[PDB]
Symmetry: C2
Subunit: 620 residues, 2 copies
């Protein structure tokens, strides 16, 4: 019944059949992206129409297509041929990654570079990375990956310990040609291993950790219906999954007495960029768009009970398409559980004699993905008190290089001769807002300091100000931690009992945004990452801050193009795009495998309720 | 046998006996503060001298004294008379708070003000608050409290729902005289009750929360020896308790191989100030120094198992002195336990085939205190990966006023006619550093953006810079979130295997600092709160950022005075004082009892270790 249910294997197979029937999926075609579309605005009024969007690649080099299918009706809604040099290449195919090492292994230039370094080609792994857009005119309209080399000494060796600096190659993964091999000079390949399961390196394992047992003897407090509809402690939502974005939350709402009150229509991480800050030509092109170029959902891990997710866990196993349109399940790819969260509210009152304490808890929805050396966890939290929070967890093995003799301003040393280039991990959260419905606006709120003088003779007063963002031209905003800057999303047509528009306040971490020079390729391609907050008017085709096709795509799409429309956002259907990230100067403690570091944001109700929403929580 | 052990009931009784015998504790004497002194530098050689520091007030108006006694040898080490008009008044006595309501109840001016408002005097509670120093010359050298009125309709009613605005009184708590009653005009007393245990207000309690059971079938992984010495997962420390500061951590060190490596010599919250930003003369003097004026440890709650602290809990029950020198135990006042903390490190490697996941945990040491309407939780965390973290949790009932007709730039509305004046809660963490020993220095680290051009042709490079703080005149620093500013404490004479000084990096939340005008009384008395980071040279007598006697001190005491010495801090025994706080514009959701909100900071190792310190953690 629910139009927000997860895609099923049968739906994916049926999309395959519809595409085949339409002549759009012959043997040379590959599915580079496939996902269910959300129901149209106002659609609830009518019957089910489950539509899927597909990006179809052609291994013969013919132009690819973007296609929308109605699986319900068995029809192709639209099919358009793409000019990729203009609008962007399709996301990288899992099958294209392996091409790189294979092709390089028989290239005379590559072999000569390896021989100069006394390296056995059979032991050289190649990290096949996205190419971006630089000065190589021959790449325009071609699907390129760039390869960086790492030595793997034996089958279970961590190759990341042994970067081969001074060497990079470019490969056309459709024509299967090595277009360039660049060798700027030999660097020693760091010899120390980074094998974090080798007893020689770990030493004797700790015997001091006693078990922590977390159980729910009566089961969890949330219910799951229709496969992915969650109800928990007044909250209601649907947990979606998309191969590009990963976990997507739909219809986040809170049951306040008799009213189901919407808060956020759709929440997702709509892009993530990982830009490298080492000016060496070996890596100066290196920027991952894990969401837009790689598709983070497709690399979601299967999460193990007791290790990845502890306690009473309810799993979802989302289905995605493989390269041929066949369904494949990611078993136990999404964890759902509730966690104790310490004290909720507490007061010991002298005058009344009443001592009161209540405990907090949060609902958790999470998944974990692996992109080469890096592993990222995506966690959404709902709290009893109405707070909504997202947290990203970064771990894995840091990307390495040689450490230059004489040091570096752009690389840190992890081990003898082993460097780790500086980089960032920057996320964009797309929050399609629906505070008490779709009529919303955003205000920027700053603390206001006041001068000592008349009306403030003791110089103690302080205040705040709010500025409504009325049009998209006014809605590209930056952090100001010093002035406690936040952004409030409110509904000017829905008032609380004190006659104030109901709202939610976004609290950012105020981490640095994109550091690259504004004239760089990456600043143009990751324009969203240069500012902390953007507000747009909702539109069906405005899904990602980087546009539909990010791979080898220049500036020209995404948020800067959307904002130019200068639409009314003052009491309208709006979308907040929040940039937030980590700036990583790797430390020795990050090696040989990195302890988790985190970044995120939260929203708290701001006069959304008529009083605390947790007065009906019982004593523990 | 450890000099860092908690005070025994007998030790306190011994101080009482020494004082009495010495003629220093007659019938008019009151103990306003009593605490054990830490060992002086390098004293681990000589045999111990357990010394206690005592502030003695005199209720007949005789001059107070600061006294040091040795319980080991049964002697008075020193007794010095204080000129309070010069150096500040002693902390407020619980017995002086009680004087205010009693005295006002028979004052004609107070009765006249209540009669105009038709309020039964027997129902009027008075919040007796610290006075500060303003324009009243007659207050110098006198102990004053200022009282604000709240109506309590019946014994179990929350009086905070019913503030009596336009009225304030000043009381001399020694001469027991009402020095002033100020009535600026009647404001309606808000009528709605704020009784969060009344079913009429809570509605039917939720029956939807199923149990979360946290147990440790083999007990906890930490050991407690000598009463308060903790060993857990490589960490070593002593948990102290002081009536002023509350929980204090001593000798935080980490066992790296066969070496016990010091990190922090002493960690405490050395002050916390709650300044109000409402320019009404009814409240414009209102600033709580919860630590310095009230003494937070004195009001520490007894914590209930299953309620306040969940799981396998080990309690400390610290002893403090009452006003007459008798020992009083705070039963179950400190919670100690370890918590699961999600994923520690994770990587799924394609090339090696090895899938690796480890879980994190943290040691928690916490207490909760109640200051009138407010309740604060203080939490220290030690993580497996070497991270040290502090978190304050703010809850309780917000301080209220009338909400003016026409609104307010300095007060928010919580309920009909009920206001909540704007205010801050600002903490000072005093960290007596000992990174690999006492020879330390601090560097300020900023991200450095780079311009596209020669050496950076693609404009992707970024870097960072570090500035050593060499002298105290250079060591008063502010946040810069935009530039990712942090501070590193290192030991220039202890290097890791890569030949870099070992260090720890402090990560601030970058919340706003003190908002008051720089010329205000509060900016002078709480100067520490105006800047994010201070570094001083260690000195025995430099304990609090606001000085020893905060109550009614005119200003300039503490950090500003210490810093003025301009001592060498470059490779010396130094102390870091971090200011961090919440700026609170109360929301409707904070009423009638406030859901917890939080603030804090953390420090992470920065090349302190030679590689990840958690490679020896076993699989779950
Ligand atoms: Cu990183
Ligand atoms: Cu507050
Ligand atoms: K059909
Ligand atoms: K003795
Ligand atoms: Na919207
Ligand atoms: Na020190």
């Amino acid at each position: 019944a629910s139009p927000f249910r997860l895609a099923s294997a049968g739906e994916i197979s049926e999309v395959q059949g519809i595409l085949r029937t339409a002549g759009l999926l012959g043997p040379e075609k590959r599915i580079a992206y496939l996902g269910v579309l959300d129901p149209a605005r106002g659609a609830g009024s009518e019957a089910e129409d489950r539509r899927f969007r597909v990006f179809i690649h052609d291994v013969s080099g013919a132009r690819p297509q973007e296609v929308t299918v109605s699986v319900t009706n068995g029809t192709v809604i639209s099919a358009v041929e793409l000019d990729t040099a203009a609008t962007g290449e399709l996301p990288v195919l899992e099958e294209e990654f392996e091409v790189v090492e294979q092709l390089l292994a028989t290239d005379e230039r590559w072999l000569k570079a390896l021989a100069a370094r006394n390296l056995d080609v059979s032991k050289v792994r190649v990290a096949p990375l996205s190419a971006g857009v630089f000065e190589y005119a021959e790449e325009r309209g071609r699907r390129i990956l760039r390869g960086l080399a790492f030595v793997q000494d034996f089958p279970e060796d961590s190759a990341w310990a042994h970067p081969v600096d001074g060497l990079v190659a470019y490969v056309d993964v459709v024509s299967k040609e090595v277009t360039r091999v660049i060798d700027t000079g030999v660097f020693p390949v760091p010899a120390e291993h980074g094998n974090y399961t080798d007893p020689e390196l770990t030493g004797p394992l700790r015997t001091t950790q006693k078990p922590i047992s977390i159980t729910q003897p009566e089961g969890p407090s949330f219910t799951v219906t229709g496969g992915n509809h969650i109800e928990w402690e007044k909250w209601s939502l649907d947990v979606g999954f998309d191969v590009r974005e990963g976990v997507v939350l739909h219809n986040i709402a809170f049951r306040d007495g008799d009213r189901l009150r919407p808060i956020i229509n759709r929440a997702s991480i709509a892009e993530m960029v990982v830009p490298y800050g080492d000016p060496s030509p070996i890596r100066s092109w290196q920027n991952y768009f894990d969401t837009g170029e790689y598709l983070v959902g497709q690399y979601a891990n299967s999460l193990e009970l007791g290790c990845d997710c502890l306690g009473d866990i309810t799993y979802l196993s989302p289905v995605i398409s493989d390269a041929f349109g066949n369904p494949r399940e990611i078993r136990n790819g999404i964890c759902m559980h509730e966690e104790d969260w310490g004290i909720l509210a507490k007061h010991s009152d002298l005058w009344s004699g009443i001592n009161y304490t209540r405990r907090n808890r949060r609902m958790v929805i999470s998944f974990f993905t692996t992109i080469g050396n890096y592993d990222y966890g995506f966690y959404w939290y709902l709290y009893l008190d109405g707070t909504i929070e997202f947290e990203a967890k970064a771990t894995g093995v840091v990307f390495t290089s040689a450490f230059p003799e004489g040091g570096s301003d752009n690389i840190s040393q992890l081990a003898p001769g082993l460097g780790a280039p500086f980089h960032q991990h920057i996320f964009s959260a797309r929050l399609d807002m629906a505070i008490d419905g779709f009529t919303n606006r955003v205000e920027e709120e700053d603390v206001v300091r006041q001068t000592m003088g008349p009306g403030n003779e003791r110089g103690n007063a302080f205040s705040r100000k709010r500025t409504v963002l009325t049009r998209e031209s006014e809605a590209v905003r930056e952090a100001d931690a010093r002035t406690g800057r936040t952004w409030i999303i409110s509904n000017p047509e829905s008032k609380n009992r004190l006659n104030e528009p109901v709202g939610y306040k976004l609290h950012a971490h105020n981490q640095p945004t994109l550091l690259a020079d504004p004239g760089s390729s990456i600043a143009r391609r990751a324009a969203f990452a240069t500012k902390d907050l953007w507000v747009t008017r909702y539109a069906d085709d405005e899904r990602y801050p980087t546009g539909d096709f990010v791979n080898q795509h220049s500036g020209g799409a995404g948020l800067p193009s959307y904002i130019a429309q200068d639409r009314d956002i003052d009491g309208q259907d709006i979308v907040v795009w929040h940039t937030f990230g980590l700036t990583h100067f790797p430390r020795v403690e990050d090696w040989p495998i990195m302890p988790v570091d985190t970044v995120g944001f939260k929203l708290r109700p701001e006069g959304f309720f008529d009083r605390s929403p947790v007065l009906d929580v019982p004593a523990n």
